[PDB]
Design a protein around this ligand. Structure first.
Ligand SMILES: Nc1ncnc2c1ncn2[C@@H]1O[C@H](COP(=O)(O)OP(=O)(O)OP(=O)(O)O)[C@@H](O)[C@H]1O
Ligand SMILES: [Mg+2]
Ligand SMILES: [Mg+2]
Ligand SMILES: [Mg+2]
Ligand SMILES: [Zn+2]
Ligand SMILES: [Zn+2]
Lengths: 42, 56, 30, 147, 117, 49, 65, 56, 162, 114, 391, 56, 263
DNA sequence: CACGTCCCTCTCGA
RNA sequence: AUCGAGAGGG
């Protein structure tokens, strides 16, 4: 449940895990598929 | 391309697969239930008529 | 004694504090 | 699945007498294949199994917290503190014949999770079956007794 | 069907090599200090620190009385090397270097091995 | 333990998924393709808060 | 969700030792592992059987009917 | 043989780029000159991404 | 945190642990700061606190001092689902990116009121157990109070070939 | 679902004889008995107390498959010496061994009291 | 279904529980593991489509592939790991264990092999007992590194008339090797003959491993004993051999390579000073680990595991590569807000000095997390390139 | 590059030889240069090679 | 004394240690197995629920009731429900139990193992009694009720063994060990420095004499003297756990004779 | 300026 | 039911 409420959709690399993602987004929590690194978690 | 080059088909099945070291290479452990839903139209003949009527 | 800096274990009391105010749905609600 | 992406289905079920057993009488709830380790590189799994081994014994919630200086060489010091093999292993005995094993078994608890994937709720099979409205070929899905 | 070879050797060289239950061996024939012999030996049943034979009996299935030695092995020969035979015991090997008893030993694919004291 | 943050609509609990967007009212400088006539472009997404 | 009658990997009965284990720390105020140890749980599969269990039924009987 | 060479060429490509995280950050020539160039090679395309003359 | 010549002290450690029976204090007391990603561009943060000022796991160049801020605890980079991973530093990163999505696939008590709500489909474990391996991040996910699995005696070993 | 009812681990079915003797055509004076509804509780036990039979040649057993509670037992003996008897002479040897354990435990047990 | 082999014909064997069950050796063709994996089943309806499946698409008919003109099935997992464990000289089997093994072979000649060792205590060699499952009429010959005619370390492989002469059985011998046992048996004997071989080995080898057992713990990812004192030095000089070039080009003195700029050049030499050192702590790891190591054992047989794995787990992870190049500067001229600006060191550019055993750092983890994603992207986003080229 | 060529004793032997690689493809002109082997030259641009040396 | 000898080390109402002198391992193990699974025992098998208003679902409370121990001393005089001749069950194969529970007290009201009473005839044989080893003599905690919850059910117990389901498991854990000093080489120890120092000598080590380094391992040594310890959940006392383990294995090998003469 | 792998399992809304 | 939307699995 928690994970769903802190979810980040990103519209259609914008996928690559970015450095500016440190501390603000989970480096591991993201779905394998047409969303890997695109839809992230907080 | 998905109605003629490829169809959904009767006489088909699917389930989780597990590995067996006491099976033979060219085999497939089919769950009982699948073998009660999956059939084969055997033709009645002197060779099989005795087996066939028992099944029935 | 209000003096010494802080340890690795002391930080956890800080984190414990952060949630007791904002929580986990912090941004969703605010 | 353990909490390190350690998925896997049940290949078979065994009773305690068919099962391998430690000398204390303890028996494994779960036997995961040693080959799921080098390729998957889940050393955190091995360490959770060693940590939880002590956590149960001394009876103290073991800090699996990430970035702290908790060594394996210290946990092992605690696991030999409780008289066990410092590295998690234990002379275990062939359940069938009852003789030992010419190798020792890394043992101990590990937090596993039952996942929303039951074979009974996944298996499907069909012959004849219902037929699509317009294409007169099988209907899609297990839900609809399809092909 | 008697002994296909009779000779004795010496405390030459002992080797483990990660192996801790079997050891390779070297040996110098005491009859003529020129007849090499090298082979593996289960040092678990028979340590080392010195006799030898061959023979071929005393086909057909196996059951559980010509044992007069201590450590005995059965195997088969797999090569013939001019200058020396090569034998194997399921997994254990053996090499007897020579040229003299060409008649006693033979190219058979069967033979026992005996060691005495 | 239910922490909320969601709505209830005709029964089902609907969640709002954080929609990400490259901020507006900022100035950005971009190169362009090798065959593109433009050598560079300066962009601003002009929008009122 | 309530004390598991009999330990999983042993068969050891541990459904009775809840309100005993629990009171070995509320009353006697002991070390959890030393309480488990005093409730006769030498094998750690039993130790975890009590130690890891959370007694969620208590947070269930809070509602009305 | 044709529907076979096709699979024989296409299986390892599709299957190699499925075991890329078994080593996590390794890259290598998975998606460097394999998948890329091969796409070029099949489409031909004059705008090659690395026109090299290895002159002896 | 913010640092000069560490802003926050063990004194402020008691200004909180007592109040448990404030955080906005630390914010207005100027001991903490909300740095967005752009304000990060013009700051320097110390990983661990005491470890970054003047056998085991190898470290790096903490001696280069100019710091302006400190990381609360390195763990806080994780999302909820990935936080429950024990020892993610001893794990190939993709393994972490999986267990993150599988912790959402698991079972166990999801709410204490399941008996009283009519939700389409829902699984509940028969005897949930708080894990033996816990991260300090868990106390805040309320995870020991609503576990997701069970501590199974796991024997990593070959046996039948099943 | 497709799981067999637990009791089929020991309860025989329609006509199934607990034991079924077949002659090992391969090697003469050998037999293979298909023990139905049994396992290494009996399997490993009978094989071992057969190995001690001086006039016994071969003694092994395989649980065909862990699903199906049943094992084949192959027994070979010296010429003429019926293997079916070698199983009887091995069985009673077990029961007579067992019976002595019971009485030696019962007496040793009846003494101590704590 | 990217394979002629990904659709095979098997004999039905109705069984309980709701899983399809298939022989562990037919995994590699379908690329199936038993982790929530799902498989289709189709069933013929006429006696001719029947014969069409059994006379063409039968699993044993397909044992050797035209794809790479080699066997596409072979021993894997349990059986492989225990078949080199079994085929040893230290590995002996006594009688009570030997008769069990002999029985499991359904095509057994029912004759007890005269024991390799007789009199002290009738013992049998691992390979010796294995040989009754190998069919008389087989001759195979392989020479490894320094393999002689009197095998030194049970090197290479030689089977003569279906019995093992010397050498340990590993992936090379019993895998899907270009000239492996599987390949030789299917050609000089037949498709269905070899198939029965597959089972005849899975029934014996697995049985032996049952009563020998095999495990793996964190103990097997531990060198620590002056090999971790050795490896750490390799990563120290590597931070100086890469610091060498780091200061060289800091004072212009960088003899730029021809073609690749000073920066490109620098990194190319730098990048391999880590990968050549991190790969040197992975052979320093492999060295200390005894032949009693479990992680080491699985890779020696070829069961599972590779050279890198031992390195990353016990020795050192290594540089993380995203889009080929190292970790770049998302922040202005720096890689992280914990790092000095314009820092080009390997610690900043994404080198994991620690192993998985030691545990990464707050930084080491993130980069390793960046690199993984790049991979997780290949395995989920760049698969549509190759599925389309195939179409 | 280390190219394998037959020694006067007949046995193949590893004799190095210098080679140049480019970042451009003008085959029609670079091959006609004096001082190379116009029989060994090679560009990865198979498109340009079809244009210069024929389809085969 | 008569061959397979014994020697008791310790013994109590729950655990029981003992050494087995001159016995075949392949046999001793087969007894461990019999003890675990194939010893007869009683426990609940069918639970008719008249009214359940608890936070625990029906079959969740069901699942455990069987898991609860029941008296089984004189179990051999209660036929298997399947072997008897009655429609369903009766008194010569089942022991009916009733568990009625209403929570009056505002304070939460616990339902225990004691709280089940038998509504059948025992015929003067020890059976069906909810084995209570509790400190405060309360038994196994089945449920918890609030101010007005309720629970009316009826349990029909039956003879059974752990094979059908481990709730008929009369044994808990079976401590098995032999040859504490690995003299027989039945396991190849694992170490990164020293095998002996890294593996602790077992408790049952003072009983066999150490190996004496300067010696040549004797293959002729065989498995002998097995260090055991059987625990009783209660269902059957720790003597009959081993006595009937020995005795019901007897019947196994003996019924093999039974059908042996029918051939 | 048209393609953008393969299947499979559930949820909901005109 | 059909179209659309989404989340998972291999
Ligand atoms: N997106 C996809 N498209 C096609 N096939 C896929 C896809 N994802 C997975 N597969 C197939 O399913 C399998 C994926 O591997 P799987 O998820 O079983 O993990 P794994 O290799 O066991 O991982 P680990 O290293 O954790 O053990 C392969 O056989 C692959 O062909
Ligand atoms: Mg898989
Ligand atoms: Mg897998
Ligand atoms: Mg996957
Ligand atoms: Zn237990
Ligand atoms: Zn009755």
């Amino acid at each position: 449940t928690l994970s769903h409420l802190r979810r980040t959709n990103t519209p259609i690399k914008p996928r690559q895990l970015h450095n500016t993602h440190w501390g603000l987004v989970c480096p591991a929590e993201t779905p394998e598929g047409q969303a890997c690194g695109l839809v992230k978690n907080l | 391309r998905g109605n003629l080059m490829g169809k959904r088909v009767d006489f088909s099945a699917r389930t989780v697969i597990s590995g067996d070291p006491n099976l033979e290479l060219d085999q497939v452990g089919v769950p009982k239930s699948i073998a009660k839903t999956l059939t084969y139209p055997e033709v009645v003949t002197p060779y099989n008529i005795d087996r066939l009527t028992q099944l029935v | 004694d209000e003096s010494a800096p802080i340890t690795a274990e002391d930080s956890w009391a800080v984190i414990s504090a952060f949630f007791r105010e904002k929580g986990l749905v912090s941004q969703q609600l605010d | 699945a353990s909490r390190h992406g350690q998925k896997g289905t049940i290949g078979i079920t065994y009773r305690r007498e068919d099962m391998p057993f430690t000398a204390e009488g303890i028996v494994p709830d779960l036997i995961i294949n040693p080959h799921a380790i080098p390729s998957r590189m889940t050393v955190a799994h091995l360490i959770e199994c060693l940590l939880s081994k002590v956590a149960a014994l001394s009876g103290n919630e073991g800090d699996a917290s990430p970035f702290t200086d908790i060594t394996v060489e210290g946990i092992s010091k605690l696991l030999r503190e409780h008289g066990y093999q410092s590295r998690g292993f234990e002379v275990m005995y062939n359940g069938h014949t009852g003789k030992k094993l010419m190798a020792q078994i890394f043992f101990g608890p590990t937090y596993y999770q039952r996942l929303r994937h039951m074979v009974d709720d996944k298996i499907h099979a069909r012959a004849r079956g219902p037929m699509q409205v317009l294409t007169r070929q099988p209907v899609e899905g297990r839900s609809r007794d399809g092909g | 069907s008697n002994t296909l070879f009779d000779d004795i050797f010496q405390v030459s060289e002992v080797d483990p090599g990660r192996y801790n239950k079997v050891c390779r061996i070297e040996a110098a024939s005491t009859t003529q200090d020129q007849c090499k012999l090298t082979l593996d030996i289960n040092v678990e049943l028979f340590p080392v620190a010195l006799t030898v034979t061959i023979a071929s009996s005393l086909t057909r299935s196996w059951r559980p009385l010509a044992d007069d030695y201590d450590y005995v092995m059965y195997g088969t020969a797999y090569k013939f090397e001019e200058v020396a035979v090569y034998y194997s015991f399921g997994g254990l090997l053996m090499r007897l270097e020579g040229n003299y008893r060409n008649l006693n030993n033979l190219k058979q694919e069967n033979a026992y091995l005996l060691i005495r004291r | 333990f239910d922490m909320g943050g969601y709505f209830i609509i005709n029964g089902s609990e609907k969640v709002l998924i954080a929609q990400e967007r490259s901020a507006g009212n900022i100035v950005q400088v971009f190169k362009k393709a090798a065959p593109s006539p433009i050598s560079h472009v300066a962009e601003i997404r002009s929008a009122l808060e | 969700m309530i004390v598991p009658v009999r330990c999983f990997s042993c068969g050891k009965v541990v459904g009775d030792k809840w309100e005993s284990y629990l009171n070995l720390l509320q009353e006697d105020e002991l070390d959890e592992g030393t309480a488990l140890s005093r409730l006769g749980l030498k094998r750690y599969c039993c130790r975890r059987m009590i130690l890891t269990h959370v007694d969620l039924i208590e947070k269930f009987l809070r509602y009305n009917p | 043989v044709g529907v076979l060479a096709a699979q024989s060429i296409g299986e390892p490509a599709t299957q190699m780029t499925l075991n890329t995280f078994h080593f996590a950050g390794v890259a290598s020539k998975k998606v460097t000159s394999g998948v890329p160039r091969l796409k070029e090679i099949l489409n031909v395309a004059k705008n090659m991404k690395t026109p090299s003359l290895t002159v002896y | 945190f913010i640092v000069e010549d560490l802003k926050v002290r063990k004194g402020h450690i008691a200004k909180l642990m007592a109040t448990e029976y404030t955080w906005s204090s630390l914010l207005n007391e100027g001991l903490v700061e909300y740095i967005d990603a752009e304000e990060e561009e013009s700051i320097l943060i110390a990983m661990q606190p005491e470890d970054l000022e003047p056998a085991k796991r190898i470290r790096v160049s903490h001696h280069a001092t100019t710091f302006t801020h400190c990381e609360i605890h390195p763990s806080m980079i994780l999302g909820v689902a990935a936080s429950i991973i024990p020892f993610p530093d001893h794990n190939q990163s993709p393994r972490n990116t999986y267990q993150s999505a599988m912790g959402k696939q698991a079972m166990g008590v999801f709410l204490t009121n399941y008996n009283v709500r009519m939700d389409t489909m829902a699984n509940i474990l028969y005897y949930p157990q708080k894990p033996l391996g816990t991260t300090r991040a868990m106390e805040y996910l309320k995870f020991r109070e609503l576990p997701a699995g069970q501590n199974a005696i796991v024997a990593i070993a070959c046996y039948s070939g099943y | 679902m497709n799981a067999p009812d637990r009791f089929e681990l020991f309860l025989l079915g329609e006509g199934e004889s607990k034991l079924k003797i077949d002659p090992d055509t391969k090697a003469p004076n050998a037999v293979v008995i298909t023990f139905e509804k049994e396992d290494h509780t009996l399997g490993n036990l009978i094989r071992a107390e057969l190995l001690n039979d001086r006039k016994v040649l071969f003694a092994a057993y395989k649980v065909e498959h862990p699903f199906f509670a049943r094992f084949k037992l192959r027994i070979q003996t010296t010429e003429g010496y019926d293997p079916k008897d070698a199983l009887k002479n091995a069985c009673n040897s077990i029961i007579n061994k067992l019976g002595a354990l019971k009485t030696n435990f019962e007496t040793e047990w009846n003494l101590q009291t704590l | 279904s990217l394979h002629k082999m990904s659709m095979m014909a098997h004999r039905v064997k109705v069984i309980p529980y709701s899983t399809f069950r298939l022989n562990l050796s037919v995994t590699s063709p379908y690329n199936a593991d038993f982790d929530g994996d799902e498989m289709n089943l189709h069933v013929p309806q006429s006696e001719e489509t029947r014969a069409e499946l059994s006379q063409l698409c039968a699993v044993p008919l397909q044992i050797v592939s035209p794809q790479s003109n080699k066997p596409c099935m072979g021993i894997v997992q349990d059986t492989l790991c225990g078949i080199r464990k079994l085929t040893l000289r230290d590995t002996f089997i006594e009688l009570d264990q030997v008769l069990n093994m002999l029985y499991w072979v359904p095509d057994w000649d029912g004759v007890i092999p005269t024991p390799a060792i007789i009199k002290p205590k009738p013992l049998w060699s691992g390979k010796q007992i294995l040989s009754v499952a190998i069919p008389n009429g087989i001759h195979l010959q392989r020479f490894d590194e320094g393999t002689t005619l009197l095998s030194p370390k049970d090197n290479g492989m030689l089977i003569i008339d279906g019995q093992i002469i010397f050498g340990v059985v590993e992936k090379k011998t019993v895998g899907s090797s270009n000239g492996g046992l599987i390949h030789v048996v299917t050609r000089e004997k037949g498709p269905q003959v070899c198939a029965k071989l597959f089972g005849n080995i899975q029934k014996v080898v697995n049985f032996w491993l049952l009563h020998n057992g095999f495990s793996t713990g964190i103990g097997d990812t531990i060198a620590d004993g002056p090999t971790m004192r050795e490896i750490t030095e390799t990563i120290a000089e590597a931070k100086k051999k890469v610091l060498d070039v780091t200061k060289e080009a800091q004072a212009n003195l960088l003899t730029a390579k021809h073609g690749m700029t000073l920066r490109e050049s620098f990194e190319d030499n730098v990048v391999r000073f880590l990968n050549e050192a991190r790969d040197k702590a992975g052979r320093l790891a492999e060295v200390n680990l005894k032949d009693l190591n479990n992680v080491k054992q699985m890779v020696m047989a070829g069961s599972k595991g590779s050279f890198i794995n031992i390195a990353q787990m016990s020795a050192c992870v290594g540089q993380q590569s995203v889009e080929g190049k190292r970790i770049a500067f998302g922040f202005v001229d720096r890689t992280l807000p914990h790092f000095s600006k314009d820092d080009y060191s390997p610690e900043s550019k994404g080198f994991v000095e620690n192993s998985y055993l030691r545990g990464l750092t707050p930084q080491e983890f993130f980069f390793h997390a960046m690199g993984g994603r790049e991979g997780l992207i290949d395995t989920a986003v760049k698969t549509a390139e190759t599925g389309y080229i195939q179409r | 590059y280390d190219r394998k060529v037959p020694s006067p004793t007949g046995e193949y032997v590893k004799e190095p030889e210098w080679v140049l690689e480019t970042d451009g493809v003008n085959l029609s002109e670079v091959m006609t240069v004096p001082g190379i082997d116009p029989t060994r030259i090679y560009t990865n641009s198979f498109i340009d090679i079809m244009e210069v040396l024929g389809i085969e | 004394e008569e061959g397979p000898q014994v020697k008791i080390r310790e013994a109590s109402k729950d655990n029981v240690d003992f050494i087995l002198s001159n016995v075949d391992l392949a046999m001793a193990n087969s007894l461990r197995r019999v003890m675990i699974a194939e010893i007869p025992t009683l426990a609940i098998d069918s639970v008719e629920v008249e009214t359940n208003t608890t936070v625990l679902a029906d079959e969740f409370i069901a699942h455990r009731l069987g898991l609860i121990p029941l008296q089984s001393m004189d179990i051999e005089q209660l036929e298997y429900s399947r072997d008897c001749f009655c429609e369903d069950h009766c008194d010569k194969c089942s022991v009916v139990l009733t568990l009625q529970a209403f929570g009056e007290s505002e304070s939460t009201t616990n339902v225990y193992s004691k709280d089940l009473v038998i509504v059948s005839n025992l015929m003067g044989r020890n059976i069906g009694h909810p084995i209570i080893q509790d400190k405060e003599g309360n038994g196994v905690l089945i449920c918890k009720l609030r101010k007005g919850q309720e629970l009316k059910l009826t349990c029909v117990a039956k003879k059974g063994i752990a094979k059908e389901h481990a709730k008929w498991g009369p044994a808990a854990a079976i401590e098995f060990e032999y040859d504490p000093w690995n003299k027989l080489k039945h396991t190849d120890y694992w170490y990164e420095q020293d095998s002996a120092k890294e593996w602790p000598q077992s408790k049952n080590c003072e009983y066999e004499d150490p190996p004496n380094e300067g010696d040549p391992f004797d293959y002729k040594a065989q498995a002998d003297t097995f260090y055991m310890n059987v625990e009783s959940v209660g269902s059957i006392p720790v003597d009959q756990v081993v006595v009937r383990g020995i005795d019901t294995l007897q019947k196994k090998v003996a019924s093999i004779l039974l059908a042996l003469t029918q051939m």
